[PDB]
């Protein structure tokens, strides 16, 4: 029963991916009305099954806790873009299409119905098939959203806000996959860590608002790299310091999900860093921006690796200074993970400091790379904070 | 212990993929010496671990049976290209590089050592890590080979033969993955079916030699499409006829591997057919080639679906005419699967009949699509023949 649902999802996803990639990367003309028509169709049956599932279940392990919160946060963002889309598109109908208008309406309906369904708590065969088709619907929306940014380059304001379709589809797919598996299942502070973390959070918040929400001057590029190098460098030292603390000091099983999620979600920033490193080593003239870009890219790999080691060891384990110091290390890393969570979440994907990478790969290729890998940093930062909350609670 | 090996493989693979994709799709210059240097490096540790594994095991479930045969068949092809590469590259050294020569030598060493290792039959942690790194080495070679064809467009003859690196890396990765999982494991003929299958095999063999080994005339394009439509159309009718035979007529468990492989490997031809259909519906003028291309693409989807249904039902089950007719249906499908196995195996990937798809997507994009999806048709055709051999044996 499980294999039938998996095969249905992949076959549906493959057909959707071919239509999305074929209609955008062809040489005759770029097609979006058919892509919108396909996505509007896929959400319809996905919404219909969920609506049927909700009605048939009203009379009648869970994954990360932060999944529900991130799903609602990005679902609301996906609702705002749809509301702005219909308002602008319904202003004039003689120049546009019906799908240009039915698609945001159906997506808004799909987001509302799916977000409520995933938030709340027998025919297992239909349930698995419906969930897996819903997973394929979200992954098709994720791929179309990624391709949409790649091919790029009052009207309800100016559509300055960008569609958060990549991030919501990631959270929805994870929640649907988790639920699909479960179908038929049988004080103490030195006043030095939190203070430093709060200062870095305040400084980074100013940088994000000043330069990252939206051509920028040289000082702006220096400020952004200076903060990130300091922020990532401090966690690298702090996480390393925490690891050697445990060195001076089994029966519980290995938390496979925690280790897989921490290392798995760190792959997104690894790919961005690896792409950036070769884009600096080659192309990026030897200049201040190249040195800052190379150090920042290298520090992301170091920060992700050494923070993961500290978190994994601390969870598995479960001198008066020993406990007091670990509270600040957990708290400093917790605050430093929150501040750099906003950049992959609410920052312009291509970024302004990525001139070297954009010149090396081109805007179309680099935009696709960041739009694929940066949203996975949202998963890592959210899971690191929750894991550090757990670590800080115990010891 | 299993998760550590998986994370090591993906992290190694991601670094290799970034170097391969970054060095070829950038806008400054296309780099291949570094890509060759990286691949030559990865095979070195992969070969060293295998060599160490073989020596340490001399003193001391299995997957599809056809995997070993296909691995040797394509491993030998990968040896021939390496022998021709060194011979041509060693003719002149003042204009070439050392990696241009060490890379084919190391690949030939890597292929010889790996093929013998996979053919033959405690530190499970090292064994899993070494196998998973070897899997990442082959997948990196597979991706570089696919990118190499995509970016395209006596010298030891004329290098007319193309590197069979895509097909061998697929067989090697499957065998390594299968072995990684198992580490620490606790007559009767109507004289109408075989005759038709033999005739189709003979006709298709002539078509493959005449036009598919290597600009072609209109008659050549008509002949190729005529045979494929007839061949795929006949299996569609024959497989459907076999399915309704069983309709006129449990305790054994579902053969998940057989169902997954049959449906999973059919995805490659589905993607090619789906890409072809939208490349005809749009672009391909309404002409004879468009009609033949559309029918052939649609018949591949029908042939794969209806053949899979007949094979899956027949295996699970395990009137005198009832048994006699199924022998011919199994034998006709067996011979018809062999003849269309050579096209994805020994035929020019872009093909001569793919002018409509090439014009729609461009040579670079279409070559990547066929070089990714067509080799998976080799897995399906080989598994269909073995499954039909099993079906013909029982009933």
Author numbering:
A (entry chain A), B (entry chain B): 28 to 87, 97 to 157, 164 to 195, 237 to 269, 287 to 314, 320 to 354, 361 to 429, 487 to 563
Task: Give sentences copied directly from the paper behind this entry.
The otopetrin (OTOP) proteins were recently characterized as extracellular proton-activated proton channels. Several recent OTOP channel structures demonstrated that the channels form a dimer with each subunit adopting a double-barrel architecture. In this study, we performed structural and functional characterization of the Caenorhabditis elegans OTOP8 (CeOTOP8) and mouse OTOP2 (mOTOP2) and illuminated a set of conformational changes related to the proton-conducting process in OTOP. Combining the structural information from both channels, we propose a working model describing the multi-step conformational changes during the proton conducting process.
To verify the importance of inter-subunit contact for channel activity, we performed mutagenesis at the dimer interface of mOTOP2. No channel activity was observed in three single mutants, including L30W, V370W, and M374W. The lack of channel activity in these mutants are not caused by low expression in HEK cells or the disruption of their dimerization, as all three loss-of-function mutants were expressed at an even higher level than the wild-type channel and all can be purified as a stable dimer. The functional effects of these interfacial mutations correlate with the structural observation of progressively increased sliding movement towards the intracellular side of the dimer interface between TM1 and C-barrel. We suspect that the interfacial Trp-scanning mutagenesis changes the propensity of the inter-subunit movement and those mutations near the cytosolic side of the interface inflict stronger hindrance to the interfacial sliding movement and mitigate the channel activity, reminiscent of the inhibitory effect of Trp54 at the N-terminus of TM1 in CeOTOP8 channel.
